[PDB]
């Protein structure tokens, strides 16, 4: 109530004339910033939103409610001054401009400014623009806590300063770091936005000192001995700078303390956890007394859809022949009707995110082990989508260009042979012309198939990326269920994709699979999918496996790149990280349960690129990051729990055998050991997804290489046609496989 009063007073101070509607508007905004801000779920937020208007109308009749309480309640001083109310759209334009400027100086990584972010920025600014404005942010990892904190700190002149924690982090290092931050804040009179995660909060020793610093405004016992004398030496200089000459030690000490209150804001970025929140309430009341707290958890559907739209701008997603389906499966209510191709794809992506939340909730209800799902998973998924779309479109484009060059060469060769005919040999030439024409129509059919693949590429890439980035912790059955759910949702969207897409082959080639089989890796579908994920990832993978096949597998895969083994328990881990960054060799890490917070900059990919240099901040030292560096995290106990901050930085690769993985393994073993013919037919069905076409492409490349030398010598018997009839026979074989795929598929299903 007193904060309500003070906020109303501060908002009313610069104004001279103000109608009653403006007063009740300020009243409502301040109540929202005090009461609705701390709420957790949506029901309480709606309850507050409706009852504030109810109270306002019940105590203030005969006033217009539209201007008095407008739905986009929002206050700031950025535009003009005097804390005047600002419209949402003009504020959005201003924050876009400031974000673009920020992109110029710091954090070039794109951010999307939706309504939630627009509100949180103003809340953070309002708390910062206040003496002793310590603040606590609560939200799931990747929701934009630290990012928005640093953005607002930069915008306000606050020099962001965050401590970094690692293992064996003694209290003396922490005390030195507080000494440094207080010296920078008070003695030198620069405002500091002091920021941290939950990782360095877990130790209870630091919480006492922070409790004193937050409540009193200054921690006794941190400054003593010669350090206190030095502190006094620059405290006198600071007093001289402000023209506040003082000589007694205690008055200067109070002046330094007051400088600390006026020029130090502490920000706590922390993961929602009811039991942990209760524990930290028990051990530190100042986190709830002095530190006003902000809630923002999972991104709303509108935030996800806006992120999807913004991050799929370079991607083509423009099908002029896209037929809008009746009864569109929609999860975003404000979807344009009729939606375009890009709108439908982004809606499907939001559906994938929401349905995986649903699957996680269902699995938790079943009593199984679940891992927290964060918006960083959505960002990683959209990155996989962009990368896969670009890569597949490129591969198809060079394949089509190769086909066109081959067709032009074939036409030139046909013209040359016609000119030669113009001059038994004639029969051979006529047969050559017939075969060349036949293979020409065959390549026209190949162009038709290429166009069909170009049609299906969008759905194929979406399913592939959704599997790689999202799934991986779940067993084989849950992965298959999620893939089917996505497939049915997209077929309800009339989006084009292969109905019998194979995830293992569409995401790799024959050579990589044989290379994996050369290393220690069983021929299991789960193992193949996990190796697929290990091949392609944006966030460094975390490996869970009870038998240890993955560790030796990724050793054998990266032996040529001098991969090294080191665990968290070993004290040489930090030195091995230094060596890996300096040289660039891969480094597998075991025993991930006893996580070391030193890897957070590595996992977060906090790279500083300036002046032809790339830097990574481990400890208080900057290290040149080698371009070819990669790290793998591994463990051995499946029944372990991970902090969601870790879960939001690594992609899970699960090797644990379940009631569905072993069932499939035994079924495949029986098929290969009892009904071999069915095994080769199933292999032919599975490898029809490009591998036969890949062999045809390679052999056609060899044929073009041979045919390039066409002058007389190619007519040794006027028939070099052996290579082209060979091509014709494998082409007929693969075509016969294509026509007869359904019958063989049904037979394999029956067996």
């Amino acid at each position: 109530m007193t904060r309500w009063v003070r906020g109303i007073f501060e908002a009313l101070r610069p104004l001279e004339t103000l109608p009653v509607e403006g007063l009740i508007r300020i009243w409502a905004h301040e109540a929202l910033r005090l009461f609705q801000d701390r709420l957790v779920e949506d029901e309480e937020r709606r309850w507050t939103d409706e009852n504030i208007d109810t109270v306002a109308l019940k105590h203030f009749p005969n006033i217009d409610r539209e201007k008095a309480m407008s739905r986009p309640i929002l206050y700031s001083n950025w535009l003009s001054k005097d804390y005047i109310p600002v419209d949402q759209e003009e504020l959005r334009d201003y924050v876009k401009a400031r974000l673009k400027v920020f992109y110029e100086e710091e954090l070039d990584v794109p951010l999307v400014l939706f309504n939630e972010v627009l509100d949180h920025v103003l809340r953070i600014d309002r708390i910062f623009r206040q003496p002793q404005g310590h603040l606590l942010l609560i939200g799931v990892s990747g929701a934009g806590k630290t990012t928005l904190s640093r953005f607002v700190a930069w915008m306000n002149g606050l020099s962001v300063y965050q401590i970094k924690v690692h293992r064996k982090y003694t209290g003396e290092d922490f005390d030195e770091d507080l000494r440094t931050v207080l010296r920078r804040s008070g003695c030198k009179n620069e405002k500091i936005a002091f920021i941290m995660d939950e990782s360095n909060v877990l130790d209870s020793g630091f919480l006492e000192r922070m409790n004193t610093l937050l409540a009193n405004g200054e921690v006794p016992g941190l400054f003593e001995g010669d350090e206190y004398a030095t502190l006094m030496t620059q405290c006198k200089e600071g007093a001289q700078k402000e023209g506040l000459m003082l000589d007694s030690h205690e008055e200067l000490y109070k002046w330094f303390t007051s400088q600390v209150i006026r020029n130090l804001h502490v920000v706590f970025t922390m993961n929602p956890s009811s039991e942990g929140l209760k524990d930290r309430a028990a051990t530190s009341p100042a986190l709830f007394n002095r530190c006003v707290l902000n809630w923002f958890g999972d991104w709303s559907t509108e935030a996800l859809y806006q992120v999807g739209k913004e991050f799929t701008s370079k991607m083509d997603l423009e099908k002029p022949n896209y037929i809008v389906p009746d009864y569109m499966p929609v999860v975003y209510d404000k979807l344009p009707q009729p939606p375009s191709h890009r709108e439908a794809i982004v809606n499907s992506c939001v559906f994938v995110h929401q349905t995986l939340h649903q699957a996680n909730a269902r699995l938790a209800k079943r009593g199984g082990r679940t891992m927290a799902i964060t918006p960083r998973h959505y960002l990683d998924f959209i990155n996989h989508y962009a990368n896969l779309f670009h890569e597949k479109r490129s591969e198809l484009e060079e394949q089509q260009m190769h086909l066109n060059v081959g067709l032009r060469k074939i036409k030139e060769t046909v013209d040359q042979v016609e000119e030669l005919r113009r001059d038994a040999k004639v029969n051979r030439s006529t047969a050559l012309l017939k075969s060349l024409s036949a293979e020409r129509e065959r390549w026209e059919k190949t162009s038709e198939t290429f166009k069909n693949q170009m049609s299906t590429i969008a759905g194929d890439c979406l399913l592939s990326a959704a599997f790689i980035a999202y799934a991986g912790y779940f067993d084989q059955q849950m992965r298959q269920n999620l893939f089917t759910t996505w497939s049915h949702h997209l077929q309800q969207a009339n989006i084009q994709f292969r109905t019998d897409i194979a995830r293992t082959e569409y995401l790799s080639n024959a050579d990589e699979r044989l290379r994996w089989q050369a290393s220690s890796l069983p021929a299991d579908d789960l193992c193949t999918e996990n190796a697929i994920m290990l091949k392609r990832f944006n966030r460094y993978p975390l490996i869970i496996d009870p038998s240890g096949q993955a560790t030796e597998f990724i050793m054998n895969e990266y032996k040529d790149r001098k991969i090294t083994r080191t665990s968290f328990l070993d004290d040489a881990f930090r030195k091995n990280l230094e060596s890996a960054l300096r040289f660039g060799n891969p480094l597998l890490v075991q025993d991930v349960e006893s996580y070391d917070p030193v890897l957070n900059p590595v996992l977060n990919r906090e790279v500083r690129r300036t002046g032809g240099r790339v830097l990574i901040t481990l400890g208080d030292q900057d290290i040149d990051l080698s371009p070819s560096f990669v790290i793998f995290l591994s463990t051995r106990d499946p029944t372990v729990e991970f902090p969601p901050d870790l879960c939001s930085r690594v992609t899970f690769v699960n090797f644990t055998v379940t009631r569905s993985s072993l069932q499939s393994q035994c079924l495949n073993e029986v098929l290969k050991a009892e009904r071999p013919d069915v095994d080769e037919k199933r292999s032919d069905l599975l490898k029809l997804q490009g591998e036969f076409q890949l062999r045809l492409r390679q052999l056609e490349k060899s044929l073009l290489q041979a045919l390039n030398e066409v002058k007389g010598r190619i007519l040794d018997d006027d028939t070099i046609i052996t290579t082209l009839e060979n091509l014709k026979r494998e082409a007929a074989e693969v075509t016969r496989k294509v026509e007869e795929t359904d019958i063989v598929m049904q037979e394999v299903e029956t067996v």
Binding site: E578, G611, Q621, I623
Partner: protein
């Protein structure tokens, strides 16, 4: 006429700018420079709109605005970071031949700092790393040259040493920091002194690790 008047005002402004630019870079105070240039901008705005519409006035106004924009570049340049080697790198990359003693604000202003913002920022960050490591080394020398052993009496027989934990912790943190400093591209400067201090730290660590055992055994056997 109006053209003659605006030409005279432009000549006065150019003379003022040239007189300010004659100040050597060593004696150019960024705060006073910003205040005086703001005064010049206020003087320029005092001209009538008819004199403001002239192209030359617009050119001088936009030049002063660019000086405003690069004033923070000037502030970062005028510090304890550039020294003389970073200035040498800047001259080498910008292909300009200046004199350090005769360096003035005019010569730097002639080179487009706004166009070369990336180069200047890279030099500033390199200098920041170099000055950070230099101050770390200065702290090393100031803490090891003034450090004294904690001597304490032993029943009027001798004067022994206490405080082993603090000294050993300082040595370990120091040796770890020095070893880690071998990383980073900034390590290429002052390498020889770094290795010399490495040798000094190893020597003191080994000597005192032997000394603690010697002292403990001597106290026990004397008892």
């Amino acid at each position: 006429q109006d053209l003659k008047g605006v030409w005279s005002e432009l000549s006065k402004v150019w003379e003022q700018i040239d007189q300010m630019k004659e100040q050597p870079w060593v004696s150019v105070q960024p705060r006073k420079l910003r205040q005086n240039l703001d005064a010049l901008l206020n003087q320029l705005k005092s001209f009538p709109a008819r004199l403001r519409q002239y192209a030359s006035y617009e050119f001088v106004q936009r030049l002063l605005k660019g000086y405003m924009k690069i004033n923070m570049l000037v502030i970062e340049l005028k510090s304890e970071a550039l020294k003389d080697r970073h200035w040498k790198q800047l001259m080498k990359r910008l292909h300009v031949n200046w004199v350090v003693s005769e360096l003035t604000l005019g010569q730097i202003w002639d080179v487009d700092l706004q166009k070369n913002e990336a180069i200047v920022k890279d030099v500033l960050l390199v200098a920041q790393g170099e000055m950070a490591l230099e101050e770390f080394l200065k702290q090393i020398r100031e803490v090891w040259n003034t450090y004294e052993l904690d001597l304490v009496n032993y029943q009027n027989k001798c004067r022994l040493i206490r405080g082993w934990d603090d000294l050993f912790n300082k040595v370990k943190e120091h040796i770890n920091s020095v070893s880690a400093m071998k990383l980073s591209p900034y390590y290429k400067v002052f390498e020889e002194d770094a290795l010399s201090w490495e040798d000094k730290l190893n020597r003191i660590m080994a000597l005192f690790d032997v000394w603690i055992d010697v002292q403990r055994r001597w106290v026990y056997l004397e008892g």
